[PDB]
């Protein structure tokens, strides 16, 4: 039943990858954003984040139970030890996956690709992110394919901060004429006390507290207590 | 909320300047479009004359920017022209609108023959020049309208000119030069010394001098 810790760790990572793949293939239509796992003694819960909670629930709450049984039956775990929650994201603006899927489903429904990209850029910048880029590549006008960019704000591409200050999301739009590749890079802002962005600043950013203005003393003036 | 950056902006925001004409009288540079919004920003109409894609050759492709030529002006006595180039068309139009507001000039209107009513045409024949493009405005009788190409017609209508004859020479196909030449011709209307302007100028107190105390104390 038990195996060494390295193999169990890689197996848990594999299970997380499987779960995320199945969910992003299933509920991306419902504004799916992300998944997470909590493990208690002899129990495992998996939580999800998606914009449209009522749509992701469905009717009679049937989808959650159905999918939970699916994963329970898929991964062979002891039955009754898996439960799937229903949570909404903190915001759809600072999440790269959510905006990538929004752009995807604006593209599939029929719309000028550059109108959709402009709209997603405006939506990102009213959301308060420190910057972003979106690249839509494929066959737009003609038979040749030209990768097409949009940037706003500022984006960093190097060092360690890209590990936590930049969120990357790559997706595909399926079209009658071809497949469009969509890459999205978002830069989270310096957001302590709430953890929507990083709690730590950019390592190259130095902030100086402003000097306090006080009356410069002339003579010792104390009062007895 | 407009927070002025210049002395003229502070005077305009604090209702020290009562019209655009006091600013024009002293030839002060207007560097904030909020001054123009304060004084005329209830009758100003903008119009994008052109979007022109220009290209700079580079190692691995042509960098393409878009230049917006935008005319602005309430259709009475004021007109401006702005040209702004940027990588985005919307940003270019926004910048061109700001620049056209910054370049708004007073338009002098006169009479063709007898002087019944309000002025309707240019006071005299004026000529504007821009890169081989020569635009001549000639006073016309009342009710003739603007006899011009569409590009100068837009600016002449936004300037409040009811009727005017025009002549053009050069490469007027370049809309930017055509527009700048007719803007020069329009702006030369008030710089022309006609015999009704021979009266000696009675100098007044400049805005920076007449409200220097307000600027110091605010």
């Amino acid at each position: 039943v038990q195996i060494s810790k390295k193999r169990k760790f890689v197996a848990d990572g594999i299970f997380k990858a499987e779960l995320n793949e199945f969910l992003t293939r299933e509920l991306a239509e419902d504004g799916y954003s992300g998944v997470e796992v909590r493990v208690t003694p002899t129990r495992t819960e998996i939580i999800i984040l998606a914009t449209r909670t009522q749509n992701v629930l469905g009717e009679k709450g049937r989808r959650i139970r159905e999918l939970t049984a699916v994963v329970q039956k898929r991964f062979g775990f002891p039955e009754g030890s898996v439960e799937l929650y229903a949570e909404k994201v903190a915001t759809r603006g600072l999440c790269a996956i959510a905006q990538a899927e929004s752009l995807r489903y604006k593209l599939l429904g029929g719309l000028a690709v550059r109108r959709a990209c402009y709209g997603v850029l405006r939506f990102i910048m009213e959301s308060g992110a420190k910057g972003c880029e979106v690249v839509v590549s494929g066959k737009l006008r003609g038979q040749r394919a030209k990768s097409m960019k949009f940037v706003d704000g500022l984006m960093i591409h190097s060092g360690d901060p890209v590990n936590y200050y930049v969120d990357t999301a790559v997706r595909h739009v399926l079209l009658r004429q071809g497949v469009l590749g969509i890459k999205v890079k978002i830069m989270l802002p310096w957001d302590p006390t709430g953890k929507i962005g990083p709690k730590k600043p950019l390592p190259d950013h130095v902030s100086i507290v402003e000097p306090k203005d006080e009356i410069l003393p002339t003579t010792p003036i104390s009062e007895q207590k | 909320e407009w927070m002025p950056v210049t002395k003229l902006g502070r005077l305009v925001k604090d209702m020290k300047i009562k019209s655009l004409e006091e600013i024009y009288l002293f030839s002060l540079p207007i560097k904030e479009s909020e001054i123009i919004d304060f004084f005329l920003g209830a009758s100003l109409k903008d119009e994008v004359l052109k979007i022109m894609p220009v290209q700079k050759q580079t190692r691995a492709g042509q960098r393409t920017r878009f230049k917006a030529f935008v005319a602005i002006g309430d259709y009475n006595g004021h007109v401006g022209l702005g040209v702004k180039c940027s990588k985005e068309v919307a940003t270019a139009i926004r910048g061109a609108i700001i620049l056209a507001k910054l370049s708004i000039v007073p338009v002098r209107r006169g009479y063709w023959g007898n002087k019944i009513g309000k002025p309707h045409t240019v006071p005299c024949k004026v000529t504007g020049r821009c890169g081989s493009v020569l635009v001549r405005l000639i006073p016309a009788p009342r009710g003739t309208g603007i006899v011009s190409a569409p590009v100068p017609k837009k600016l002449l209508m936004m300037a409040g000119i009811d009727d005017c004859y025009t002549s053009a020479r050069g490469c007027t196909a370049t809309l930017g030069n055509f527009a700048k030449a007719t803007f020069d011709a329009i702006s030369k209307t008030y710089s022309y010394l006609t015999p009704d302007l021979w009266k000696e100028t009675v100098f007044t107190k400049s805005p920076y001098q007449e409200f220097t105390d307000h600027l110091v104390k605010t």
């Binding site: 737009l140 006008r141 | 979007i51």
Partner: peptide, 26 residues
């Protein structure tokens, strides 16, 4: 609206170039 602006920036010198530039204002 901005649809023409955006499709123009995709192909500034494409087949749909004079049309879109004119559709902006003319």
């Amino acid at each position: 609206f901005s649809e023409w602006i955006d499709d123009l920036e995709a192909d500034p010198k494409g087949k749909f170039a004079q049309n879109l530039l004119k559709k902006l204002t003319g």
